[PDB]
Every structure is written in structure tokens, then in C-alpha cells.
């Protein structure tokens, strides 16, 4: 493509692109060590095989939860903020925000580590939910995650203190309508002057289509193993694909921008 990786660095450096919307998947969490529940071999698939789970989709299936929610609360426990660090790929993003460049961070993830990298609540669109806030699956009463963290860590299934319903974190489950925060896509995507897709496979809709809601003057960037999604069916005149490992692409990109030392110090500060 006429546009390289440096070009995308230089535009940012010169401060041409100042409101970068970023679309992140599970590609950035791999090197934090987030074990894939599905993967017949990961750290969490072995513990959930003793548990009642026919297919991996079952955990975020609402019906199946009501029969047996403990594999969700065994997952959640394994994910509850404290287990895992963020890596370079988050601290890069946080540095966008620190440098007044991040418009919005749309994320598929549920591991909480964007916020851990010190991004505010407002800059995020946790598309498949969060392990921050809860909501009772009968009376709908909202609770702080702390309330219902005490129960998960102890091997108790949380239940609403008023109505006794099983209190469920605000993870989105297969079928559930996406958080009202998602509605921001309407404003952010046509209001973006840089698209940055960090480690996501782009299979599922809607999340993919939003790649096209940007404006055709706008460059779309993709750091990922391979060229997937609506870049791989409808590329455009300003697309670039850092095709390879996500981390090293983030390490090259950082360098071509000239945020080595500030990346070097940030990460030293935060950890």
C-alpha cells in the first residue's frame, strides 16, 4: 500500500491524526497469559472439564447459567482483577490517552486490563461487558463488583440480598443487547481520524462492520497475525497491515513514533 508503517507514525507525530479510535480483541491479551477457556489445552479448559460444560459457549449462555453458573464463577474467579498483568500493548494504548490522542477504546475483551493500564472508564467501550459492575438477574438491582467479589472468591454463588436472584456481572452473554455505551459507535466512528485494529480476528458482527463506518479519507491500521475481516474483503486506499506478531508491531510502531523512553518509563512506573 502507498502508505507504509512510518507514514502512520509520522502523521501521529506531526499531530495530523489526533482522535484515534482503537479496536482491540484477544490478540493483545495472549502475551499477558490469558488462558482460552475453549483451547483444549489451556490453563482454564482443564478446570472447566470437571465442570458441567458441553460446549465452550455454554458459560456465556444465559439459560445454562441458571442450571450451573459455577463454571462462570470459576472463570470469573480466575479472571477477577488481581490475577493478571497488562503488557506493552495496553501501555501503548494508555500512552495514546496520556498524549491526548485516544478518542475511544472499543474492546471485545473481558479481562479488565485496559482499565488496569490506567485508561479512564469514559474512554472505554467494553463491548462484551465488564467485571466491575453487577446486576441481579431477577430484580435487576445494580451492585458494586466488590459486593459480589467477596462471594465469588469464597466459592459461594452470589444471590441478591433483597430478592434472592443470582447476581450476575455485566458481562454480555450470547443474545444479550450490547451495553448502552456501545451506542457511542454512532458518534465515534464517523468522528475518527485514525482506525487502529489491535489483535482481533474480526469474524463476529457487529464489531467488524464498524471498520467501514469510518470515513474513506481515514487510514485504517491493523496490527495482527493476518489480514482479516472487512479489510480482507473491502480494503481501501489508505489501509496498512502490520502483518506479524502484535507485540513486535507495537514495538516497531512505538519506535517509529519515538515513544521508546516514555514507554520504557511508563511501564516501569505502573508496575
Amino acid at each position: 500500500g502507498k502508505l507504509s508503517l512510518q507514514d502512520v507514525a509520522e502523521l501521529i507525530r506531526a499531530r495530523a491524526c489526533q482522535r484515534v479510535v482503537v479496536m482491540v480483541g484477544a490478540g493483545i491479551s495472549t502475551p499477558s497469559g490469558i488462558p482460552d477457556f475453549r483451547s483444549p489445552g489451556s490453563g482454564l479448559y482443564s478446570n472447566l472439564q470437571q465442570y458441567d460444560l458441553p460446549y465452550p459457549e455454554a458459560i456465556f449462555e444465559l439459560p445454562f447459567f441458571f442450571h450451573n453458573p459455577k463454571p462462570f464463577f470459576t472463570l470469573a474467579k480466575e479472571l477477577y482483577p488481581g490475577n493478571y498483568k497488562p503488557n506493552v500493548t495496553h501501555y501503548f494504548l494508555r500512552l495514546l490517552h496520556d498524549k491526548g490522542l485516544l478518542l475511544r477504546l472499543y474492546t471485545q475483551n473481558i479481562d479488565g486490563l485496559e482499565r488496569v493500564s490506567g485508561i479512564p472508564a469514559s474512554k472505554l467501550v467494553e463491548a462484551h461487558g465488564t467485571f466491575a459492575s453487577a446486576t441481579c438477574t431477577v430484580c435487576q438491582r445494580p451492585f458494586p463488583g466488590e459486593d459480589i467479589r467477596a462471594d465469588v472468591m469464597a466459592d459461594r454463588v452470589p444471590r441478591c440480598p433483597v430478592c434472592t436472584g443470582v447476581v450476575k456481572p455485566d458481562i454480555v452473554f450470547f443474545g444479550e443487547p450490547l451495553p448502552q455505551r456501545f451506542l457511542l459507535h454512532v458518534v465515534d466512528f464517523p468522528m475518527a481520524d485514525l482506525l487502529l485494529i489491535l489483535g482481533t480476528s474480526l469474524e463476529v458482527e457487529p464489531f467488524a462492520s464498524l471498520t467501514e463506518a469510518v470515513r474513506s479519507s481515514v487510514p485504517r491500521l491493523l496490527i495482527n497475525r493476518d489480514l482479516v475481516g472487512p479489510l480482507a474483503w473491502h480494503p481501501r486506499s489508505r489501509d496498512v497491515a502490520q502483518l506479524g506478531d502484535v507485540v513486535h508491531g507495537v514495538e516497531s510502531l512505538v519506535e517509529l513514533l519515538g515513544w521508546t523512553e516514555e514507554m520504557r518509563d511508563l511501564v516501569q512506573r505502573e508496575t
Binding site: 462484551h128 450470547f174 444479550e176 443487547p177 456501545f182 457487529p206
Partner: peptide
């Protein structure tokens, strides 16, 4: 519209 936008469900998971």
C-alpha cells in the same frame, strides 16, 4: 439491535 446490537446484540451479542
Amino acid at each position: 439491535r446490537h446484540k451479542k
